[PDB]
Short mmCIF file of C-alpha atoms in Angstrom, two decimals:
data_model
loop_
_atom_site.label_atom_id
_atom_site.label_comp_id
_atom_site.label_asym_id
_atom_site.label_seq_id
_atom_site.Cartn_x
_atom_site.Cartn_y
_atom_site.Cartn_z
CA UNK A 23 72.11 9.09 104.78
CA UNK A 24 73.92 8.55 107.75
CA UNK A 25 73.22 9.17 111.16
CA UNK A 26 75.78 9.62 114.47
CA UNK A 27 74.03 10.81 117.34
CA UNK A 28 75.36 11.56 120.85
CA UNK A 29 74.09 11.07 124.24
CA UNK A 30 75.44 11.30 127.72
CA UNK A 31 75.19 12.30 131.40
CA UNK A 32 74.60 16.09 131.05
CA UNK A 33 75.75 17.50 134.52
CA UNK A 34 78.03 15.25 136.55
CA UNK A 35 80.32 15.62 139.67
CA UNK A 36 84.43 15.70 139.13
CA UNK A 37 86.06 12.61 139.94
CA UNK A 38 83.07 10.34 138.68
CA UNK A 39 83.60 8.64 135.25
CA UNK A 40 81.26 8.56 132.43
CA UNK A 41 80.54 6.95 129.29
CA UNK A 42 79.22 9.02 126.36
CA UNK A 43 77.82 6.70 123.41
CA UNK A 44 77.77 7.45 120.00
CA UNK A 45 75.07 5.82 117.91
CA UNK A 46 75.55 5.43 114.48
CA UNK A 47 72.68 4.44 111.65
CA UNK A 48 73.49 4.02 107.83
CA UNK A 49 76.96 2.50 107.72
CA UNK A 50 78.83 -0.22 109.16
CA UNK A 51 81.52 0.18 111.94
CA UNK A 52 83.44 -2.17 110.74
CA UNK A 53 84.14 -0.19 107.07
CA UNK A 54 84.52 3.40 108.87
CA UNK A 55 86.97 4.76 111.77
CA UNK A 56 84.88 7.15 114.48
CA UNK A 57 86.55 9.72 116.21
CA UNK A 58 86.22 11.27 118.99
CA UNK A 59 86.85 15.35 119.27
CA UNK A 60 85.35 17.84 121.91
CA UNK A 61 84.89 22.10 122.34
CA UNK A 62 85.46 23.45 125.50
CA UNK A 63 82.71 26.37 125.86
CA UNK A 64 83.77 28.98 123.42
CA UNK A 65 87.17 27.48 122.46
CA UNK A 66 88.47 25.44 119.67
CA UNK A 67 88.41 21.68 118.53
CA UNK A 68 90.50 19.22 121.02
CA UNK A 69 90.95 15.74 119.10
CA UNK A 70 90.48 13.33 121.79
CA UNK A 71 90.61 9.21 120.05
CA UNK A 72 89.78 7.28 117.35
CA UNK A 73 88.54 3.76 117.09
CA UNK A 74 89.46 2.37 113.66
CA UNK A 75 87.01 -0.23 111.91
CA UNK A 76 89.25 -2.51 112.89
CA UNK A 77 88.97 -2.01 116.25
CA UNK A 78 92.76 -0.24 116.90
CA UNK A 79 92.16 2.68 118.85
CA UNK A 80 94.63 5.95 119.02
CA UNK A 81 94.56 8.73 121.42
CA UNK A 82 95.56 12.43 122.47
CA UNK A 83 98.57 11.84 124.23
CA UNK A 84 98.29 14.56 126.93
CA UNK A 85 94.74 12.44 127.61
CA UNK A 86 95.33 8.57 126.89
CA UNK A 87 95.91 7.69 130.57
CA UNK A 88 91.95 8.95 131.42
CA UNK A 89 90.62 7.78 128.21
CA UNK A 90 89.20 4.84 126.69
CA UNK A 91 87.05 4.39 123.48
CA UNK A 92 85.45 1.31 122.23
CA UNK A 93 82.41 -0.19 120.25
CA UNK A 94 79.83 -3.14 120.06
CA UNK A 95 79.57 -3.26 116.16
CA UNK A 96 76.35 -5.19 116.69
CA UNK A 97 74.46 -2.46 118.66
CA UNK A 98 76.41 0.20 116.24
CA UNK A 99 77.22 2.24 118.94
CA UNK A 100 81.09 3.62 119.78
CA UNK A 101 81.64 4.83 123.54
CA UNK A 102 84.04 7.06 125.21
CA UNK A 103 84.80 6.51 128.36
CA UNK A 104 86.57 9.39 130.76
CA UNK A 105 87.64 8.43 134.31
CA UNK A 106 88.18 11.00 137.01
CA UNK A 107 86.70 13.84 135.56
CA UNK A 108 87.64 17.21 136.35
CA UNK A 109 85.88 20.71 135.85
CA UNK A 110 88.18 21.45 132.51
CA UNK A 111 86.77 18.36 131.08
CA UNK A 112 83.50 20.74 130.50
CA UNK A 113 82.84 20.70 126.84
CA UNK A 114 80.41 19.27 123.78
CA UNK A 115 81.55 16.15 122.98
CA UNK A 116 81.41 14.38 119.67
CA UNK A 117 82.24 11.90 117.27
CA UNK A 118 82.51 12.17 113.52
CA UNK A 119 83.07 9.04 110.72
CA UNK A 120 86.16 9.20 109.16
CA UNK A 121 86.86 7.36 105.43
CA UNK A 122 89.96 8.56 103.56
CA UNK A 123 91.32 11.42 105.09
CA UNK A 124 87.93 13.78 106.36
CA UNK A 125 85.63 13.07 109.29
CA UNK A 126 82.51 13.42 106.85
CA UNK A 127 79.87 13.00 109.15
CA UNK A 128 79.54 14.50 112.52
CA UNK A 129 76.80 14.07 115.33
CA UNK A 130 75.06 17.08 117.16
CA UNK A 131 77.29 16.83 120.22
CA UNK A 132 76.17 15.88 123.68
CA UNK A 133 77.21 18.41 126.39
CA UNK A 134 79.24 17.28 129.37
CA UNK A 135 79.42 19.74 132.40
CA UNK A 136 81.40 18.76 135.12
CA UNK A 137 79.98 20.59 138.31
CA UNK A 138 80.10 20.08 142.07
CA UNK B 18 103.10 15.72 118.12
CA UNK B 19 102.40 18.20 115.48
CA UNK B 20 100.52 21.44 116.41
CA UNK B 21 98.70 23.38 113.93
CA UNK B 22 98.54 27.28 114.24
CA UNK B 23 95.59 29.19 112.61
CA UNK B 24 95.94 33.23 111.82
CA UNK B 25 94.45 35.76 111.80
CA UNK B 26 92.53 34.09 115.23
CA UNK B 27 89.51 36.48 114.31
CA UNK B 28 88.75 38.54 111.27
CA UNK B 29 85.99 41.13 110.50
CA UNK B 30 84.74 41.00 106.81
CA UNK B 31 82.09 42.60 104.83
CA UNK B 32 79.93 40.71 102.63
CA UNK B 33 81.85 40.50 98.97
CA UNK B 34 85.02 40.51 100.37
CA UNK B 35 87.91 37.76 99.52
CA UNK B 36 89.92 36.75 102.57
CA UNK B 37 92.42 34.27 103.46
CA UNK B 38 93.22 32.19 106.53
CA UNK B 39 96.26 29.93 107.22
CA UNK B 40 96.85 27.44 109.02
CA UNK B 41 100.55 26.24 109.44
CA UNK B 42 102.16 22.87 111.00
CA UNK B 43 105.21 22.57 113.39
CA UNK B 44 106.21 19.66 110.87
CA UNK B 45 105.66 18.74 107.36
CA UNK B 46 102.27 16.65 107.35
CA UNK B 47 102.71 16.02 103.59
CA UNK B 48 99.25 17.84 102.37
CA UNK B 49 97.03 15.90 104.19
CA UNK B 50 95.30 18.79 105.71
CA UNK B 51 91.08 19.41 106.16
CA UNK B 52 89.55 22.57 106.93
CA UNK B 53 85.81 22.49 108.21
CA UNK B 54 83.65 25.52 108.96
CA UNK B 55 81.22 25.30 111.94
CA UNK B 56 78.28 27.53 112.86
CA UNK B 57 77.00 28.59 115.83
CA UNK B 58 75.43 26.10 117.48
CA UNK B 59 76.16 23.29 114.64
CA UNK B 60 78.46 20.75 114.43
CA UNK B 61 81.91 21.18 112.13
CA UNK B 62 81.00 20.72 108.56
CA UNK B 63 83.50 19.42 106.21
CA UNK B 64 84.39 21.95 103.34
CA UNK B 65 87.96 20.54 101.66
CA UNK B 66 90.57 17.90 102.05
CA UNK B 67 93.68 16.58 101.25
CA UNK B 68 94.45 20.61 100.55
CA UNK B 69 92.59 21.15 97.49
CA UNK B 70 89.39 18.84 97.29
CA UNK B 71 86.06 20.59 97.88
CA UNK B 72 83.49 18.61 99.76
CA UNK B 73 79.89 17.49 97.62
CA UNK B 74 77.88 20.70 97.81
CA UNK B 75 80.71 23.25 98.92
CA UNK B 76 80.62 26.05 96.58
CA UNK B 77 83.36 27.09 94.48
CA UNK B 78 84.23 30.25 96.25
CA UNK B 79 86.10 28.37 98.48
CA UNK B 80 89.80 27.08 97.64
CA UNK B 81 92.58 25.45 99.58
CA UNK B 82 96.26 25.30 98.43
CA UNK B 83 99.44 24.55 100.37
CA UNK B 84 102.32 21.93 101.18
CA UNK B 85 104.92 21.14 103.48
CA UNK B 86 103.93 22.83 106.74
CA UNK B 87 101.88 25.92 105.26
CA UNK B 88 98.36 25.69 104.27
CA UNK B 89 95.75 27.98 103.13
CA UNK B 90 91.67 28.67 102.86
CA UNK B 91 90.84 31.64 100.31
CA UNK B 92 87.21 32.41 100.14
CA UNK B 93 86.68 34.96 97.37
CA UNK B 94 83.35 37.38 97.36
CA UNK B 95 82.56 36.40 101.14
CA UNK B 96 78.52 35.51 101.13
CA UNK B 97 76.49 35.92 104.67
CA UNK B 98 76.29 32.11 105.09
CA UNK B 99 80.07 32.05 105.16
CA UNK B 100 80.56 33.20 108.46
CA UNK B 101 81.41 31.35 111.44
CA UNK B 102 84.42 29.46 112.39
CA UNK B 103 87.03 27.58 110.53
CA UNK B 104 89.41 25.01 111.76
CA UNK B 105 92.04 23.04 110.09
CA UNK B 106 93.04 19.69 110.87
CA UNK B 107 95.67 17.31 110.03
CA UNK B 108 95.78 13.38 109.14
CA UNK B 109 99.51 12.80 109.36
CA UNK B 110 100.15 9.83 111.29
CA UNK B 111 98.63 9.97 114.75
CA UNK B 112 97.98 11.94 116.78
CA UNK B 113 95.77 13.85 115.01
CA UNK B 114 95.23 17.56 115.97
CA UNK B 115 93.13 20.81 114.75
CA UNK B 116 94.35 24.31 114.10
CA UNK B 117 92.83 26.66 117.28
CA UNK B 118 90.34 28.14 114.77
CA UNK B 119 89.57 31.47 113.15
CA UNK B 120 86.30 33.15 113.96
CA UNK B 121 85.25 35.31 110.54
CA UNK B 122 82.64 37.80 111.74
CA UNK B 123 80.43 40.16 109.76
CA UNK B 124 81.73 44.31 109.46
CA UNK B 125 80.39 46.77 111.32
#
């Protein structure tokens, strides 16, 4: 039993910066990668980035400058931080575990709504 | 970056029908392709990875195929629990990307 549960601030005003937490349970963050994925309302999934078990990160090219992913191995949490929120950052945000070319366990997602 | 294009974007189908949905890559992804199903209000669930391998507990009526830039997921005799959205995702180098999705909706 692998668990990933995301929590975030809900409704935020634009231009603020945010952090979303993915708290994981049942597996070690040094042995698997965690990916961040978001889905705008009624749209498809957009890959945001990932942090590897060794701490290396990779990002979506388009968003790389506004995004930062980090983790705290001891607390079993992975963070997604975004600065200068725009209204089109409204989406459900998911973290998902990766092992051997698949995202096998996903959290339920947290809804971020950027509204004035 | 490699872009994934899925067709059809939407498909109406009846229970018992066989459907095939495709995922085309803008560059060779060397079979590193996974398929996910997402039901309304739920997170995506892994179905198929490295083109043909079914994840644990996926029914045998699902099968994936493909190579190079062309991949397909065939669902034989659709059951009610299969309607929903299907996404392909590649794992060739980085960035990874998802196709835009195919919404499979029950026929009327």
